Design a protein around this ligand. Structure first.
Ligand SMILES: O=C(CO)[C@H](O)[C@H](O)[C@H](O)CO
Ligand SMILES: O=C(CO)[C@H](O)[C@H](O)[C@H](O)CO
Ligand SMILES: O=C(CO)[C@H](O)[C@H](O)[C@H](O)CO
Ligand SMILES: O=C(CO)[C@H](O)[C@H](O)[C@H](O)CO
Ligand SMILES: [Mn+2]
Ligand SMILES: [Mn+2]
Ligand SMILES: [Mn+2]
Ligand SMILES: [Mn+2]
Lengths: 288, 288, 290, 289
């Protein structure tokens, strides 16, 4: 099992010098660094090539996460937004190929975070979404990318909140390059059973995000890690496990994640490094 | 220990025929019926004695919960809003005295749900709210009412997300009729420890809400009920326990609570009644 | 879905008692089953058996039997005479169960209990002899309409079968339809890496289930992962019954064999014991099904 | 918080070349090695200093565990047995002071493992033990050693099975050098609450043994480690935490601990080293803070 961490653990915006973090997590011992997709459309082929060679240099595999904007909403009733959305993913997926990135994940069937003042049309958005995603999936297959649909709690998305819903959606899309993606922070709120949710995901599970109930690094909270290790083994899980902890207030990140107190408790970068590393040793130990 | 249930488990709006529910709930065996404060301001004085008479007749104690509107926001920087807020609560509290209810709870130091598209000024809102709630406390005291401030998850409020924050706020208010309030659904997201959160609240805990991780009735979910029961015993809790399950889509209730799937799985009124009653026997049994 | 019972010994300190009294009590508390100790059964005259049967039937109660065998009834003994005496004991007992209209017996039927550890242990050898003996006793049980359940116990009470995997291995070797694995939350709590895992491991072989908290209090207020147990029973499609086996009182052969060295009941009188068992029944039906 | 491990994790008898293990565990990263008291009386005065030399050298602190024989039973109704028991502990404890060991633990108030074949007189054994222990306590306060009374499950002892009984006995002894000692293996069986038991022990908690429900090294089993760490923080535990894993069949250890299946799953000494090391990282991570 490959273990990684989301660069955002150290940053407050959906961009950063990914080369800096590639070097950092290589030395902390991770196998993967997960980066936000939004700055990638602004990269020249020269920039793409050196990010790839840097990852290759430090032996880090790169995975991508993305919280779509309203403009990239594949489920939109607006046909122009859906058209712009597909063009965005078509370009993005092609860049992922140039980067030898074989996985992208997040609320890709919608946008994040949802603006709840709009009016929800779950039934309508769901049907439009399944159609849009199946299309994008052809481009994903061509670029060799696993398009992972993350199940989110109710406050962040209304389309897919439980693993069963995720499996329903993915089965309805019916394209091998579309997988279900689970996240322990999200399962903690919505699921009746954690091992149960993983087992329900089964062969469709393409990616796993980890964090404690309140998003601290994995291990000293209430998430049932041993139960998760068991269920992953039950489904013969063959994917990466990326920790996505958020412990700092401020910026677009603190605001979108809703960190309203200093959960890191004054950690400086070295302290943050120490804990991610301890949480990595924990995860390899307990989850495999 | 007194056990209750929030009338909203059967309804999709913040008001209903409370007399009907007093009768149902007395028949299911509950000690308490919790009702939404929303309609109480507009109750003729006859309606108040009728509701009050019904409760006494059926041996049911009434408690009140309230998600305040933006105009009732005691933390608002706008002085006219704070003035209205205070007028709202003084009138509501006098009515509660007439209705013979001694407890009100919710995000009373703020408003609910939070419109996150407005800028967040936590420190400023915090200082204002503490000062505002302290004034209201005087009236709550005159009316024989415990003013309980509920600790909520990050997605529903930004001022108080943990038992420690709630205690810091209440001690700062420094008035005997202002209490901390916890909710198992909210604790499940924010806390490092459930039992620890309860022990942190300690003497300040004046009310407790229950529900599974995903708001189903207590019992077959992942909430650590025994640990909650053991911590209530540790602190010597002398209050009540009200389950607040939300399993139905639709209306203001379904959208404020964000129920996007039929969690009840088709239950009709009779089936909701039985599940409520089974969770009551579980609750009395496990929480002691 | 499942039938729920309680072992009569929750109220008694010897491995026998007036079972009719307990059938009447548990029927009123709402149980489907009363599990009784086998020990006094070889001394029941035919009419005593019929009265016990009529009492259970008249009260809509189903009887199951538990048995901690004596060293003289050790089917795994290296002594050929003890094994012979053992088989005769079981044959006679199974026929009595047939007269009683009882279809399930469980416990350390492949050994004896409590095990005297001052004796040298020969696991490999005892295992082989046991498997052999069980096979032939199983044939008698089959003819009597009785499922022979082998209970997986913790290390301090037996050395042959301490985990669900060992229980499944042993039961597969026996290779007889009416011979089954039986799990008990108190024993799994000690030996198993995973509770749900153990149950899923037992799978289609699981024929009986005993319940009790970690220190043997009635189910519900302790640390046993009940919810997890319910999911795993649903995963394996468990059809059988679930019998809580609380032991909260000091004294007698029961207190001594179960090693209750403090008053875990906290001074409960009979009526108090009755109330807890009933709440624990309500809890078990609510949490364990679906 | 110092972390250790019991040497018997690698051995099948209650003795071994403790130097080999001090060097092993120092390399593995442990702060402490716990050794069995059994072979200690047979040590000559020279043998003591060597062992103590080998320990300070490697920067390892030594704690001692001891499951008493019937003849060292401080709770015995036989005055001659109680007499020899105090003699045994007085001698053993003087040796411990010459080793600069400051803590000993186990069913020191009785014997282990007990023969349940005999007649048990809990009330009587309890009263004799309380007095005997309080006496031995004087000698312990003298050799600068903490006399730790470990709470055991019903199958291994009948005098003290819960933290509450442990605290009651210790408070009865009423002596600064006698502490309560908990063990996750035993608490897992007897306690209503793990964190509750630790909080009950409170300031009386003098030592802690860890292990999974079935005695594997800490980490991948069902023990509530986080709850344990939060509870140690609640009581401000300063003490040592010693893992006591037992995964091997055979010998007196295999028989006393009752390992009747190869729980190690064919691990060799190198494999056992790795798991203990990983469990150590887990324990320092989860248990602290
Ligand atoms: O868990 C998440 C949001 O709460 C998802 O992984 C988002 O796609 C990610 O955080 C966006 O950066
Ligand atoms: O838990 C709650 C909202 O999440 C609070 O109790 C609210 O005040 C209540 O649900 C509003 O009706
Ligand atoms: O769990 C058990 C003993 O520990 C078994 O069920 C015994 O056979 C039973 O209690 C004996 O009556
Ligand atoms: O846990 C123990 C016995 O189960 C105690 O620590 C014993 O004293 C120790 O194992 C003796 O070697
Ligand atoms: Mn995520
Ligand atoms: Mn609430
Ligand atoms: Mn049993
Ligand atoms: Mn120990």
């Amino acid at each position: 099992m490959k273990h990684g961490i989301y660069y955002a653990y150290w940053e407050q915006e959906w961009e950063a010098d990914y080369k800096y973090y590639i070097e950092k997590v290589a030395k902390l011992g991770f196998d993967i660094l997960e980066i936000a997709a939004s700055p990638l459309p602004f990269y020249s082929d020269i920039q793409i090539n050196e990010l790839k060679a840097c990852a290759h240099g430090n032996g880090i595999t790169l995975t991508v996460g993305h919280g779509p904007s309203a403009e990239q909403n594949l489920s939109s009733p607006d046909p122009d937004i859906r058209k712009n959305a597909k063009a965005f993913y078509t370009d993005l997926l092609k860049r992922l190929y140039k980067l030898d990135v074989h996985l992208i994940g997040g609320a890709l069937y919608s946008y994040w975070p949802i603006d709840y003042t709009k009016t929800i049309d779950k039934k309508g958005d769901w049907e439009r979404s399944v159609e849009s995603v199946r299309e994008v999936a052809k481009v994903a297959e061509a670029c060799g990318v696993d398009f992972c649909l993350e199940v989110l709690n109710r406050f962040e998305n209304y389309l897919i909140n439980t693993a069963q819903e995720g499996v329903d959606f993915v089965k309805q899309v019916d394209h091998n390059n579309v997988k279900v993606m689970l996240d322990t922070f999200h399962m903690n709120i919505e699921e009746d059973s954690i091992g149960g949710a993983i087992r329900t995901a089964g062969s469709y599970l393409g990616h796993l995000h980890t964090g404690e109930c309140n998003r601290k690094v994995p291990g000293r909270g209430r998430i049932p890690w041993v139960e998760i290790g068991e269920a992953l083994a039950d489904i013969g899980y063959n994917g990466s496990v990326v920790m996505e902890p958020f412990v700092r207030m401020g910026g677009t990140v603190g605001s979108n994640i809703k960190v309203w107190r200093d959960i890191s408790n004054g950690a400086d970068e070295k302290m943050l490094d120490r804990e991610a590393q301890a949480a990595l040793d924990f995860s390899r130990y307990v989850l495999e």
